[PDB]
Design a protein around this motif. Sequence first.
Motif, PDB file in Angstrom:
ATOM      1  N   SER A   1      -7.961  -2.162  -4.355  1.00  0.00           N
ATOM      2  CA  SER A   1      -6.657  -2.261  -3.860  1.00  0.00           C
ATOM      3  C   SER A   1      -6.524  -1.967  -2.301  1.00  0.00           C
ATOM      4  CB  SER A   1      -5.758  -1.405  -4.786  1.00  0.00           C
ATOM      5  OG  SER A   1      -5.645  -0.071  -4.343  1.00  0.00           O
ATOM      6  N   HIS A   2      -5.308  -1.950  -1.732  1.00  0.00           N
ATOM      7  CA  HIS A   2      -5.094  -1.905  -0.265  1.00  0.00           C
ATOM      8  C   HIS A   2      -5.488  -0.474   0.260  1.00  0.00           C
ATOM      9  CE1 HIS A   2      -2.069  -5.565  -0.155  1.00  0.00           C
ATOM     10  NE2 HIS A   2      -3.317  -5.937  -0.537  1.00  0.00           N
ATOM     11  N   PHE A   3      -6.270  -0.441   1.330  1.00  0.00           N
ATOM     12  CA  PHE A   3      -6.714   0.832   1.877  1.00  0.00           C
ATOM     13  C   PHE A   3      -5.427   1.674   2.134  1.00  0.00           C
ATOM     14  CE2 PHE A   3      -8.514   3.356   5.634  1.00  0.00           C
ATOM     15  CZ  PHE A   3      -8.971   4.387   4.752  1.00  0.00           C
TER      16      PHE A   3
ATOM     17  N   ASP B   1       3.703   3.294   0.299  1.00  0.00           N
ATOM     18  CA  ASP B   1       3.929   1.906  -0.238  1.00  0.00           C
ATOM     19  C   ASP B   1       3.514   0.742   0.641  1.00  0.00           C
ATOM     20  OD1 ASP B   1       6.803   3.616  -1.048  1.00  0.00           O
ATOM     21  OD2 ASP B   1       5.346   2.853  -2.612  1.00  0.00           O
ATOM     22  N   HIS B   2       3.364  -0.427   0.009  1.00  0.00           N
ATOM     23  CA  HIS B   2       3.150  -1.630   0.754  1.00  0.00           C
ATOM     24  C   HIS B   2       4.263  -1.946   1.785  1.00  0.00           C
ATOM     25  CE1 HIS B   2       1.113  -5.287   1.861  1.00  0.00           C
ATOM     26  NE2 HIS B   2       2.269  -5.919   1.748  1.00  0.00           N
ATOM     27  N   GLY B   3       3.902  -2.543   2.914  1.00  0.00           N
ATOM     28  CA  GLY B   3       4.812  -2.527   4.031  1.00  0.00           C
ATOM     29  C   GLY B   3       4.392  -3.595   4.987  1.00  0.00           C
TER      30      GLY B   3
ATOM     31  N   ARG C   1       4.012   1.833   5.335  1.00  0.00           N
ATOM     32  CA  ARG C   1       2.975   0.890   4.985  1.00  0.00           C
ATOM     33  C   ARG C   1       1.671   1.613   4.542  1.00  0.00           C
ATOM     34  NH1 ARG C   1      -1.319  -1.139   9.056  1.00  0.00           N
ATOM     35  NH2 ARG C   1      -0.092  -1.080  10.954  1.00  0.00           N
ATOM     36  N   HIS C   2       0.788   0.821   3.995  1.00  0.00           N
ATOM     37  CA  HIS C   2      -0.556   1.231   3.957  1.00  0.00           C
ATOM     38  C   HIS C   2      -1.287   0.962   5.256  1.00  0.00           C
ATOM     39  CE1 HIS C   2      -0.166  -0.988  -0.050  1.00  0.00           C
ATOM     40  NE2 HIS C   2       0.240   0.264  -0.319  1.00  0.00           N
ATOM     41  N   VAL C   3      -2.292   1.817   5.462  1.00  0.00           N
ATOM     42  CA  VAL C   3      -3.173   1.685   6.605  1.00  0.00           C
ATOM     43  C   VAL C   3      -3.724   0.251   6.610  1.00  0.00           C
ATOM     44  CG1 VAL C   3      -5.380   2.432   7.541  1.00  0.00           C
ATOM     45  CG2 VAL C   3      -3.756   4.049   6.901  1.00  0.00           C
ATOM     46  N   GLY C   4      -4.060  -0.343   5.446  1.00  0.00           N
ATOM     47  CA  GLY C   4      -4.726  -1.665   5.339  1.00  0.00           C
ATOM     48  C   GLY C   4      -3.799  -2.891   5.466  1.00  0.00           C
ATOM     49  N   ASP C   5      -2.523  -2.635   5.714  1.00  0.00           N
ATOM     50  CA  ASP C   5      -1.439  -3.616   5.619  1.00  0.00           C
ATOM     51  C   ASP C   5      -1.276  -4.216   7.041  1.00  0.00           C
ATOM     52  OD1 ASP C   5      -0.904  -3.716   2.941  1.00  0.00           O
ATOM     53  OD2 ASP C   5       0.968  -2.454   2.945  1.00  0.00           O
ATOM     54  N   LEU C   6      -2.176  -5.099   7.378  1.00  0.00           N
ATOM     55  CA  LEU C   6      -2.127  -5.872   8.580  1.00  0.00           C
ATOM     56  C   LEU C   6      -1.329  -7.218   8.503  1.00  0.00           C
ATOM     57  CD1 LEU C   6      -5.777  -5.257   9.720  1.00  0.00           C
ATOM     58  CD2 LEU C   6      -3.751  -4.093  10.467  1.00  0.00           C
TER      59      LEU C   6
ATOM     60  N   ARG D   1       5.945  -4.308  -3.966  1.00  0.00           N
ATOM     61  CA  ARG D   1       5.812  -2.943  -3.384  1.00  0.00           C
ATOM     62  C   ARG D   1       4.385  -2.388  -3.349  1.00  0.00           C
ATOM     63  NH1 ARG D   1      11.364  -1.019  -4.598  1.00  0.00           N
ATOM     64  NH2 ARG D   1      10.877  -1.709  -6.744  1.00  0.00           N
ATOM     65  N   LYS D   2       3.464  -3.076  -4.008  1.00  0.00           N
ATOM     66  CA  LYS D   2       2.130  -2.586  -4.185  1.00  0.00           C
ATOM     67  C   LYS D   2       1.240  -3.463  -3.338  1.00  0.00           C
ATOM     68  CE  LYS D   2       1.760  -0.120  -8.929  1.00  0.00           C
ATOM     69  NZ  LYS D   2       1.726   1.328  -8.487  1.00  0.00           N
ATOM     70  N   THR D   3       1.313  -4.774  -3.546  1.00  0.00           N
ATOM     71  CA  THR D   3       0.353  -5.656  -2.907  1.00  0.00           C
ATOM     72  C   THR D   3       0.941  -6.664  -1.896  1.00  0.00           C
ATOM     73  OG1 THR D   3       0.119  -7.596  -4.387  1.00  0.00           O
ATOM     74  CG2 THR D   3      -0.637  -5.465  -5.130  1.00  0.00           C
TER      75      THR D   3
HETATM   76 ZN   LIG Z   1      -0.552  -3.046   0.996  1.00  0.00          ZN
END
Ligand SMILES: [Zn+2]
Lengths: 157, 157
Positions: A67-69, A75-77, A84-89, A140-142
């Motif tokens: 899943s997202h780092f 939450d996803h963002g 956001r997540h750190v991995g949410d570029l 909200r997750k991915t």
């Molecule tokens: Zn995410």
Amino acid sequence: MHHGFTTPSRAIAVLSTETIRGNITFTQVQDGKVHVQGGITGLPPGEYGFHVHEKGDLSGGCLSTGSHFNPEHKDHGHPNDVNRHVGDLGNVVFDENHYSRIDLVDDQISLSGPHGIIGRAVVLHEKADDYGKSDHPDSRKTGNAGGRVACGVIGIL
Amino acid sequence: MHHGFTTPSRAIAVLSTETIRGNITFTQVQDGKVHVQGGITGLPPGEYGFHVHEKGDLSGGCLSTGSHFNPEHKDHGHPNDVNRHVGDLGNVVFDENHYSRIDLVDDQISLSGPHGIIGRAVVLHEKADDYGKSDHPDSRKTGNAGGRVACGVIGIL
Ligand SMILES: [Zn+2]
Ligand SMILES: [Cu+2]
Ligand SMILES: [Cu+2]
Ligand SMILES: [Cu+2]
Ligand SMILES: [Cu+2]
Ligand SMILES: [Zn+2]
């Protein structure tokens, strides 16, 4: 002779599928920022979800990158959101010529510490990230970015 | 919520070529040791050079992983030599069935610090490592293991 720890100041990930070729370089810049730059060919024009996933594990193809780092447990963002997540570029954009220019700066991912993405996975998505702003229940997750058409592990450059 | 640094306690690298499939897992064990275990199919029976190369860079295929991970500035060596590189994990052995069991413990590579191999590259060689014990002039630098038939970046598992 034995050394203390050196933090890498550059990393890269390489996307290659039957259709897809891309290099994405991650470079440590001033002010706790990372400069993410590359280019990828081989998708029609449009937006696709572009993220760092937690594991550099390709044993199960892209599925094993998990899943997202998310070390901050948020939450996803949108990359500009605080939540956001750190991995949410966010999204990459393929032009009419089927080529993505990637060129951005992100203040959350790092090349070391708890937000260190070395050894983690870049995942390219088959459709677009919705920024956790929909009512799909994945949103909200991915975000909701569909499959995972390509991925590569972030390595030391 | 923001965290201090966690050292990963497991990593993996995935080798997949047209002919070659292999997973190699690296697991932090007691006493500053790493337990390297996997299995790879797709080479005839024999010995091949198996190393950690410095860069997790696949943009140039296996060529971009550069030379043998060497932070201690030593010469090429047998894994049991004092004078080795950190990345000098010796030879893998393919059986008559074309399958390598990898199963060893190495006290030089680590999953963090200056001997940290996360983000670095596993490289599988087309012929055997000579342990820097020949008079080929590469022998002291690379052993003499020929091309690089496969490689993958070490990721967080
Ligand atoms: Zn995410
Ligand atoms: Cu994703
Ligand atoms: Cu926590
Ligand atoms: Cu080598
Ligand atoms: Cu030095
Ligand atoms: Zn060596």
